[PDB]
From a paper:
Here, we reveal the mechanism of AA inhibition on DHAD and the self-resistance mechanism of AstD, which is encoded by the self-resistance gene astD. Our structural and kinetic analysis of the mutant AthDHADs has validated the hypothesis that larger hydrophobic amino acids surrounding the active-site entrance enhance resistance to AA.
To understand the resistance mechanism, we determined its crystal structure (2.30 Å) by molecular replacement using the AthDHAD as a searching model. Although AstD was purified and crystallized under the same anaerobic condition as that of AthDHAD, the electron density of [2Fe–2S] cluster, Mg2+, and residues 191 to 241 cannot be observed in the crystal structure. We generated homology models of this missing region, along with Mg2+ and [2Fe–2S] cluster with VMD, using the structure of AthDHAD as a template. The overall structures of AstD and AthDHAD are very similar, with an RMSD of 0.706 Å for 462 backbone Cα atoms. The main difference around the AA binding sites is the size of the substrate channel. The distance between V199 and G512 in AstD, the conserved residues forming the narrowest part of the active site entrance, is 7.7 Å, whereas the corresponding distance in AthDHAD is 8.0 Å.
Numbering used by the authors: 69 to 82, 90 to 117, 125 to 185, 238 to 598
């Protein structure tokens, strides 16, 4: 009739149907439910990052074409969450995310931290009947959001992203969170830079005893109070601000007041007294090889300086095959560059799992540093640096390095330097020629045309 219409956006690929429960709750609250579905992530890696744009574009399109008054989003898989939040920032109409439930991914905890979910959503397991009851009572949350006009730009403030980076830092830190939180902040009109991540990492310790290098899993947090208990603990220590409005109509502090604290005998989150590391893992490095920035998680076991000989590879398998031929030697310090894997070169910055694993399997973690304009995934006992800007496809210095060049990685200076003369670097750029875009037609052709560099979250509609 004249009731508000609530779009219910799912990202589904064929266990309860959470979307059907949301629909019945929205109807019971006096609103009109409108379920719709979106494609998502669910060689194949080259479509993953650009699927985030398809989610943001698709949901924005339906929300605006039909002009739904509010949004409930069920991203399902964790990898569908960023594009879901970007669509909310574009419409800026009252919206809420319902996490699918627990099944080291920190982004769902960070999204609840920012207040785009009811308390416990991100830590409640998918099995639990409490996940069903959350969706059974989401209708009144949406009606309250419409009554009090709680919009994504009211909730996703600059301080909300500060809390998100801190919580991510506390739990170990994701390098993908750099891409996604910058893009999500961009969608609500907030300028978030890689240097903002460095600032948090300098002042915030690492407290979560989590695998692969720790003892516990993120699923273990639910049994000691879940995400609300974690926020209560960080609020008690004064590390986060709880005064920000959320989708419930209350602040973070008000939301978590009624939830129980951590049990005193918990060893998943270290006390501030005894941190696993006094500063954050995530480090931003620039220098003559990555003047536009780069991203790496630094444990401290890599050492504080790595100077070595460059060996360059224009695709992932080229490195693995040169490794298997014994062209990378023990006792020598070698800096491996795997380039043309960036946003446009990949395309889509495909996550490479094999380079870091192959170096541990050969006992070279202390003799080999890894650099790329794309992404690494596994862990290495040496330097793992990605997101190097400009990428090789754009003609950055990473494309101009040659075998035999000296490269320095300094973790305290936070530079990756190509030890060649500036005149020579400019001469090499005058000889470089851009290869064609990998795809001349289709969705990847359009994505390559629009995508920004990694230091801007690879947003595709023009960084603010």
């Amino acid at each position: 009739m004249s009731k508000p219409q609530v779009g219910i956006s799912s990202v589904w690929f064929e266990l309860h149907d959470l979307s059907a429960i949301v629909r019945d709750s929205v109807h019971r609250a006096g609103l009109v439910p409108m379920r719709f579905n979106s494609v998502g992530v669910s060689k194949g890696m080259r479509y993953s990052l650009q699927s985030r744009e398809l989610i943001a574009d698709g949901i924005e399109t339906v929300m605006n074409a039909q002009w739904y008054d509010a949004n409930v989003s069920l991203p399902g898989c964790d990898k569908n969450m960023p594009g879901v939040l970007m669509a909310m920032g574009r419409t800026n109409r009252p919206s809420i995310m319902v996490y699918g439930g627990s099944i080291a991914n920190t982004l769902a905890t960070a999204i609840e931290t920012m207040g785009m979910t009811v308390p416990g959503s991100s830590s409640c397991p998918a099995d639990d009947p409490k996940k069903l009851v959350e969706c059974e009572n989401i209708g009144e949350v949406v009606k309250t959001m419409l009554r009090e006009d709680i919009k994504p730009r009211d909730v996703l403030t600059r301080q909300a992203f500060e809390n998100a980076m801190i919580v991510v830092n506390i739990l170990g830190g994701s390098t993908n969170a750099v891409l996604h939180l910058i893009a999500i902040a961009d969608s609500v009109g907030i300028k978030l830079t890689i240097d903002d991540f460095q600032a948090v990492s300098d002042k915030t310790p690492f407290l979560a005893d989590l695998k692969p290098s720790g003892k516990y899993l993120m699923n273990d947090l639910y049994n000691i109070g879940g995400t609300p208990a974690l926020l209560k603990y960080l609020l008690k220590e004064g590390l986060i601000d709880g005064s920000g409005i959320t989708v419930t109509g209350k602040t973070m502090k008000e939301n978590v007041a009624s939830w129980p604290d951590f049990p005193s005998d918990q060893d998943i989150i270290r006390p501030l007294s005894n941190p696993i590391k006094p500063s954050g893992h995530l480090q931003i490095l620039r220098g003559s090889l990555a003047p536009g920035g780069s991203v790496g998680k630094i444990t401290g076991k890599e050492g504080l300086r790595f100077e070595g000989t460059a060996k360059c590879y224009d695709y992932e398998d080229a490195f693995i095959e040169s490794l298997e031929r014994g062209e990378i030697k023990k006792g020598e310090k070698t800096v491996v560059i795997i380039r043309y894997e960036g946003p446009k070169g990949g395309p889509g910055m495909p996550e490479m799992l094999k380079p870091s694993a192959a170096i541990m399997g050969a006992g070279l973690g202390q003799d080999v540093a890894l650099l790329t304009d794309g992404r690494f995934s596994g862990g290495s006992h040496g330097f793992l640096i990605g997101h190097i800007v400009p990428e090789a496809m754009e003609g950055g210095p990473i494309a101009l390095a040659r075998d035999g060049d000296r490269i320095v990685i300094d973790a305290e200076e936070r530079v990756v330097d190509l030890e060649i003369p500036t005149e020579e670097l400019e001469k090499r750029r005058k000889e470089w020629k851009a290869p064609p875009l990998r795809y001349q037609k289709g969705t990847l052709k359009k994505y390559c045309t629009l995508v920004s560099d990694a230091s801007h979250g690879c947003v595709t509609d023009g960084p603010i």
